[PDB]
């Protein structure tokens, strides 16, 4: 079978924490009073949730209410435990309350008010400095959650809320997040198609925090090259083909061999054989002002097939691409 793998960093964090920390199925939810909150306007609708601008009538504070549909309601304890464990961490969305309809039994998460603007709305208009600045803010959140034994597993522009005027960023939607336990085989049906790192696409289950780093690299590539999404696959199989047309197939087969991954035979007629393309091939007159040797060196060190070979969030924070960021 497949060769085991362990995270290079924060490997045994959860072993050194009590079961109360990571045993979300045993968590006793602290329910607030639903009548403290009133809906103002609908902000959107996820695959398993509904989001609203709302108000806390006990103190007139603006809040965001996320109503969880049955499939998300079933894993609510995991999302709640992760949000409470990470609460107060850098650029982590703050969970303010948890309520439930006494009639329908529908649960809802109440969060700290965040301006209703996602990264995707602006990330295609930013200056070179702003891309570095916001990337660094996302890295602070990822290094924190990874250091706390948690993988986000759904890093993408829509899950990054930015108040551009106040240069403030929050990592949201922890509904797919999980606790990392070394040697654990996880469900590969995580992350959105364009931000799925290769381990998911080849059904390699023993992945870790480095999955979030591949997704972050996909966001960077889209930002610096003005190409949304950067790897534009039509399904999970074609997504791996789009990646192989850039990273090349030689390194893919070396990766599959290293971890003894069984490559689905459907890939036989579609992957083909491709050279590794130089990152400079994506540079053109409309994006050249966002590209630098440091941006390309950094991107090259995130977008690697081998999950252990990718920069960690803290190593990424130390890259020269971020030297101009005011820390």
């Amino acid at each position: 079978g497949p060769v085991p793998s362990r995270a290079r960093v924060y490997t045994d964090v959860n072993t050194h924490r009590p079961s109360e920390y990571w045993d979300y199925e045993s968590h006793v939810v602290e329910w607030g009073n639903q009548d403290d909150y009133q809906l103002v306007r609908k902000l959107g609708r996820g695959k398993y949730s509904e989001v609203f601008e709302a108000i806390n009538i006990t103190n007139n504070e603006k809040v965001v209410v996320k109503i969880l549909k049955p499939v998300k309601k079933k894993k609510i304890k995991r999302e709640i435990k992760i949000l409470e464990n990470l609460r107060g961490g850098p650029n982590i969305i703050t969970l303010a309350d948890i309520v439930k309809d006494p009639v329908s039994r529908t649960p809802a998460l109440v969060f700290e008010h965040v301006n209703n603007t996602d990264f995707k709305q602006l990330y295609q208009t930013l200056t070179d400095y702003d891309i570095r600045f916001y990337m660094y803010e996302i890295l602070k959140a990822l290094d924190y959650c990874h250091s706390m034994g948690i993988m986000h597993r759904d890093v993408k522009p829509h899950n990054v809320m930015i108040d551009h005027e106040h240069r403030k960023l929050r990592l949201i939607d922890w509904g797919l997040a999980e606790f990392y336990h070394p040697g654990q085989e996880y469900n590969v049906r995580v992350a959105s198609r364009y931000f799925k790192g290769p381990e998911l696409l080849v059904d390699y289950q023993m992945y870790d925090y480095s999955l979030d780093m591949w997704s972050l690299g996909c966001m960077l590539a889209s930002m610096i090259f003005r190409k949304e999404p950067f790897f534009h696959g039509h399904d999970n199989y074609d997504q791996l083909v789009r990646i192989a047309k850039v990273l090349g197939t030689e390194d893919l087969y070396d990766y599959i061999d290293k971890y003894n991954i069984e490559l689905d035979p459907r890939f036989n007629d579609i992957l083909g054989r491709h050279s590794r393309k130089r990152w400079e091939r994506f540079v053109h007159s409309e994006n050249q002002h966002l590209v630098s040797p440091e941006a390309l060196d950094f991107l090259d060190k995130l977008l690697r097939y081998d999950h252990q070979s990718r920069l960690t969030a803290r190593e990424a924070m130390e890259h020269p691409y971020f030297y101009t960021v005011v820390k």
Binding site: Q34, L39, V40, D101, V103, A108
Partner: peptide, 13 residues
Amino acid sequence: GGRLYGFKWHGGG
């Protein structure tokens, strides 16, 4: 008698 998933609404203003 006007609730969405049990929440009342706060419009106008």
